[PDB]
Design an enzyme around this catalytic site. Sequence first.
Site, PDB file in Angstrom:
ATOM      1  N   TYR A   1     -12.274  -2.926  -1.450  1.00  0.00           N
ATOM      2  CA  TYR A   1     -12.812  -3.364   0.125  1.00  0.00           C
ATOM      3  C   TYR A   1     -14.604  -3.280  -0.300  1.00  0.00           C
ATOM      4  O   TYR A   1     -14.951  -2.907   1.331  1.00  0.00           O
ATOM      5  CB  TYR A   1     -12.113  -1.925   0.280  1.00  0.00           C
ATOM      6  CG  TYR A   1     -11.082  -2.252   1.192  1.00  0.00           C
ATOM      7  CD1 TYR A   1     -10.796  -2.953   1.441  1.00  0.00           C
ATOM      8  CD2 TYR A   1     -10.318  -0.966   0.525  1.00  0.00           C
ATOM      9  CE1 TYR A   1      -8.978  -3.384   1.898  1.00  0.00           C
ATOM     10  CE2 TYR A   1      -8.838  -0.900   0.692  1.00  0.00           C
ATOM     11  CZ  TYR A   1      -8.205  -2.319   1.760  1.00  0.00           C
ATOM     12  OH  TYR A   1      -7.189  -2.207   2.332  1.00  0.00           O
TER      13      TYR A   1
ATOM     14  N   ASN B   1      -0.497   0.252   7.467  1.00  0.00           N
ATOM     15  CA  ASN B   1      -0.596  -1.814   7.985  1.00  0.00           C
ATOM     16  C   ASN B   1       0.346  -1.758   6.399  1.00  0.00           C
ATOM     17  O   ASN B   1       0.746  -3.107   6.229  1.00  0.00           O
ATOM     18  CB  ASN B   1      -1.243  -2.454   8.675  1.00  0.00           C
ATOM     19  CG  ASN B   1      -2.100  -2.510   7.605  1.00  0.00           C
ATOM     20  OD1 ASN B   1      -2.594  -1.780   6.682  1.00  0.00           O
ATOM     21  ND2 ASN B   1      -3.086  -3.631   8.219  1.00  0.00           N
TER      22      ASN B   1
ATOM     23  N   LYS C   1       0.494  -1.081   0.272  1.00  0.00           N
ATOM     24  CA  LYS C   1       0.051   0.080  -0.578  1.00  0.00           C
ATOM     25  C   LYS C   1       0.699   1.267  -0.355  1.00  0.00           C
ATOM     26  O   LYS C   1       2.219   1.498   0.841  1.00  0.00           O
ATOM     27  CB  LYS C   1      -0.745  -0.279   1.263  1.00  0.00           C
ATOM     28  CG  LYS C   1      -2.215  -1.347   1.496  1.00  0.00           C
ATOM     29  CD  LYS C   1      -3.193  -1.651   1.888  1.00  0.00           C
ATOM     30  CE  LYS C   1      -2.798  -1.106   3.454  1.00  0.00           C
ATOM     31  NZ  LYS C   1      -3.881  -2.238   3.826  1.00  0.00           N
TER      32      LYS C   1
ATOM     33  N   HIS D   1      -1.744  -5.673   1.736  1.00  0.00           N
ATOM     34  CA  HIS D   1      -2.699  -5.886   1.693  1.00  0.00           C
ATOM     35  C   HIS D   1      -2.727  -7.497   0.995  1.00  0.00           C
ATOM     36  O   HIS D   1      -2.112  -7.647   0.580  1.00  0.00           O
ATOM     37  CB  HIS D   1      -3.422  -5.438   0.826  1.00  0.00           C
ATOM     38  CG  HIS D   1      -4.750  -6.246   0.575  1.00  0.00           C
ATOM     39  ND1 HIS D   1      -6.416  -6.615   1.065  1.00  0.00           N
ATOM     40  CD2 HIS D   1      -4.847  -6.945  -0.497  1.00  0.00           C
ATOM     41  CE1 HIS D   1      -7.035  -7.141   0.538  1.00  0.00           C
ATOM     42  NE2 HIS D   1      -6.391  -8.098  -0.517  1.00  0.00           N
TER      43      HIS D   1
ATOM     44  N   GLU E   1     -10.026 -10.910  -5.745  1.00  0.00           N
ATOM     45  CA  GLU E   1      -9.373  -9.658  -6.427  1.00  0.00           C
ATOM     46  C   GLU E   1      -7.790  -9.481  -7.385  1.00  0.00           C
ATOM     47  O   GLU E   1      -8.236  -9.004  -8.090  1.00  0.00           O
ATOM     48  CB  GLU E   1      -8.007  -9.268  -5.126  1.00  0.00           C
ATOM     49  CG  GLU E   1      -9.286  -9.682  -3.951  1.00  0.00           C
ATOM     50  CD  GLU E   1      -8.538  -9.618  -2.798  1.00  0.00           C
ATOM     51  OE1 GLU E   1      -7.524 -10.130  -2.131  1.00  0.00           O
ATOM     52  OE2 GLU E   1      -9.544  -9.337  -1.402  1.00  0.00           O
TER      53      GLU E   1
END
EC number: 2.7.4.6
Lengths: 150, 150, 150, 150, 150, 150
Positions: free
Chosen positions: D51, D114, D11, D117, D128
Site C-alpha cells: 500500500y 471490501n 483479504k 484486492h 505486486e
Amino acid sequence: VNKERTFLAVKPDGVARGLVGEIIARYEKKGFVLVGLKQLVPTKDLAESHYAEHKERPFFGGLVSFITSGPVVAMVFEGKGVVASARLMIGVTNPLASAPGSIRGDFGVDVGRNIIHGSDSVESANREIALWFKPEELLTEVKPNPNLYE
Amino acid sequence: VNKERTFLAVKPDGVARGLVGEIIARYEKKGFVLVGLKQLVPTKDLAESHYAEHKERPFFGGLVSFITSGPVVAMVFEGKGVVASARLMIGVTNPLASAPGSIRGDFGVDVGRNIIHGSDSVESANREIALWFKPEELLTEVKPNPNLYE
Amino acid sequence: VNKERTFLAVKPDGVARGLVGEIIARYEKKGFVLVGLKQLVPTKDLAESHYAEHKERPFFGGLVSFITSGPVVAMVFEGKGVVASARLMIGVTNPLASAPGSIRGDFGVDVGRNIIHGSDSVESANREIALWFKPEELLTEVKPNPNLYE
Amino acid sequence: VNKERTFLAVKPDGVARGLVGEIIARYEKKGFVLVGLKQLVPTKDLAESHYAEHKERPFFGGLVSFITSGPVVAMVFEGKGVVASARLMIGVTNPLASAPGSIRGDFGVDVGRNIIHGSDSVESANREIALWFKPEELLTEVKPNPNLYE
Amino acid sequence: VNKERTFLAVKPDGVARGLVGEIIARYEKKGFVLVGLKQLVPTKDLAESHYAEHKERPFFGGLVSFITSGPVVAMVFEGKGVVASARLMIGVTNPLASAPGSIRGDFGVDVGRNIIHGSDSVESANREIALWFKPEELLTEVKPNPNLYE
Amino acid sequence: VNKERTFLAVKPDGVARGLVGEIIARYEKKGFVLVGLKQLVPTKDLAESHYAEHKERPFFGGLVSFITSGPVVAMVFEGKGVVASARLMIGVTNPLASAPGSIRGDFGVDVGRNIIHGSDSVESANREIALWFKPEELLTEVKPNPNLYE
Ligand SMILES: O=c1ccn([C@H]2C[C@H](F)[C@@H](COP(=O)(O)OP(=O)(O)O)O2)c(=O)[nH]1
C-alpha cells in the site's frame, strides 16, 4: 449508521414461482441481517395503505388486487445503506430492462409480475415496516458479522 | 394424500450463518409448499414443550438454552410424504456422518450445532405445528404445481 | 478435538478443469478452516514419497508420472473429524460409483483421473501435511466460527 | 497478448467469511489460468510496501493493520486483458455501489471490509506480483484452454 | 470403452418446470458428451414402442398418454459407464425415496411425475437411441476432454 | 406480444466447454419458453447465410470455418421482448467488456470465442429461425407460466 432497515416483500408471483429462498439468500450473502420475516395473505386495507401513493393512478386497482390474491413473504433487512442496496439488487420497474445479476433481471419478464417490492427510501421503509410488522415481531438485539463492518 | 405437513425450524446457528434462504430454496425446488413462515426468538416454555421428549435427558438443558439464545425461522411445508422427505434432506443427527447433498451433510460439523430441526413423524409434526403456529398463520388454500402430482 | 487436520490435493486434472475454487468452497461451506494452501508442480521425490504405499503396485508408475505432470493445489483443512468427513465428501475410488453430491460423484468419470486426493486416516494426514507443508506455511492460531461448535 | 497477469488477494474478511473458493471459481469460469496461489498472514513490511502509494493518506494505517490482522489468500491469474477484467469482476471501491453480479456487489457492504484486492494496472500488477510471489512459485508453462482463444 | 451411450429424456413435467438446463448441466459437469439433443412432442406410436415392456402393465396407458401430453427433450450422452452413471444420478423410481443430490431426489415428489427417463441397460439404450434419433442427428466424431480419461 | 421469438445458438466453444445447460437454465429461470432445440454441426452454407452481413469483413473466413468446426446447440425461445432481453443477458461483442452477470461477461475472454449467438432484431430472429428450423420442429401452442404475465 448500519442500523438502517428496509421493507422487502416477495409478491404472490415470486412465492408461487418458488423464489422465496433464492431472494432471501441474495440478501444474506450480501451481509444484511433479517430483522423480521413472515408469510401472510395481505388484506385490502393493508394493500391499499401500502400503495397509497398510487391511489390516484389507473393501475392502483390492479396492484391492490394481485397483492391480496395470494400469500406474500414480507421481511425486513438491516444494514448500512440497505434501502438503496436492496433496490440496486432488485433491478428496475421493468424486469426486461433490468440487468442480468439483479433479481428482476434474472427472473422477471412483466412489470405487473415483477416478483418483489423494496422500499424506495428511508422514509417509506419506516412507514411500510410499521404497516406490515408489529414491534414484537422485529428483533431488537441485532449485531452483525464483524467481518462486514469496520 | 399430498396434504401432509411437517415443521422445520432453522435454529440460531443456521440463521446466524446465513443459511435461511439456502434451506428454504431446497424445499421449494423439491415441490413442497410453504404453508407458514415466521422468525422469532423462542421462549423457554416453547423451547421446553417442544423438546419435551428429552426433558429427562442430560443435554435437554443445553437444547432449551440454545434454541432460545437467538432467532429461529420456523416454517411449515406441505406435500406428499413431506415429513419423511424433509428428514431425508436434512440428514442424520450427526452432520459429520450426514451424506453430501443433505443440509447437515453440506453445512454441519457438530451435533449441538446441527442447523435445522425437522419433525420425525406425522404425529410430532401435527403437535409442533400447533405449538409454533396459530391457525390464522397457516394457509388453508394450498394448491401446488400440477407438474408435481399425477 | 476440533484441531484435527487432513491433507487434500486437487490434482492436475482437477486443476486443469477449473475445479479448484469449487472444491475449496465445498469445504468452506462445511465449516472447516483452511490452515494451509499453495499451488506447485510436484517433484518425483515428493510424488513417490506421497504414494509410498503403492510403490509395489502396477499403477504406481502412472500415479507418480501424472501427479507431476502439472500443477497441484495442495491444501490443509482443520476441524472436527475432518479426515473422515473430507473423504466422505470426496466420494469413493471410482468416481462412477461415487454418489451424486460428492466431488468425484459430480465431476469424475475415470479412476485414473479422479480429481482430488484426501488423507485416509489421521496417521497419514499428519505424514502428508509434513511432506507437502513447512511449519511456517501452516496457521497456528486457527479459531473457527462459534456457530459451528458447541 | 494473453500472457498478461494480475494480482488478486482475498483479504482477511473475505477469507474469514468463507469466500475463497467462490472468488477463485469466478475467475476459473471466466477462463483465466491460476499461475500462483498461496495463503499467508501478511507482515507489516509487505502490507506497507503493498500500500505504498497510500502511505501519506489517513487510512493507510488501518489498511496495513487490517491486511495483517489475519490470513490472506494471494493469487495470480493469467489471461487476455485480465487486469481490467479482474477489476470489472471485482466491482468498485464501495461495495454498496457495486452492481449485482460483481464480487463486491454480491457480498460486500463496507469499503473498509471490501473482500478482495486487485491490481489497477499492468504496471502495478507486475510490481505486486513480485512483492508477493517468488519466481519459483509462479508457473512458467501456462497454456490455456484452446476453446478460449482464437 | 468410453464410447458407451445412453438415452435420457426430460419428460413434460421436467420441461414444464424449467429443469432442462439444470439436468443437462449435471451431465456436462460429470464429463459426458452430448451426442444428440432435440425437443419434440412424442407421438403415440413412439411413446408405445418406447414403453413396450410395460404394454401389459396397468399404468401403461397413463405412461403413453402423459409422455405425449407435451414436449420432451430427448438427448444422448456418451462416456464411460454412462448408462449406469446416468441412472445413479437420476435416483430411483420413487423420487421421495431418492437420496438428496440426485435429480429425482432434489426435484421430484411423485412417481408419475418423476421428471426424467434414463435407459436401464446398454441393450435398452441402443434400442431407445435408434427409436428417437436418426443416424444423421447423432455425432460421429465425439472426442471428450483429455483430463477425463487416462 | 408475448409470442415474440429469438434465435440463440451455443457455439462450438460454448458446447465444448460444457456451457449448454448453464445457458439454457438462464433463459428458463427468466421465464422464456423453449420453442425449438437441437444439436447439429452447421454446414458451410448454413454458416455463410447465417453470417451474410460479415461476408466482406476480414474475419468472415474464420467465422464460417469455426461455426462449422464442431457441434452447435441451436434453440428458439419465446416470450415478451425476448430478442432484446436475450441480447442484454448475453452481454456485448467483447466478453472482456461484458458485465459480470451476463453470459459472455461471466465465461468469455475472446471475441472470436464468444460462446453464444443471439439475434439482434425481430427481423433477424425470424430470418434465422427459418434458416435453422423446419416448421415441424417448432412448437405452436405455447402456454407460458401465468405468474410471468399479467
Ligand atoms: O474481429 C472480430 C469481431 C467479431 N467476431 C465475430 C463474433 C461473432 F459471432 C460475429 C458477429 O459479431 P457481432 O455481430 O459484432 O457481435 P455479436 O452480435 O455480439 O455476436 O463476429 C470475430 O471473429 N472477429
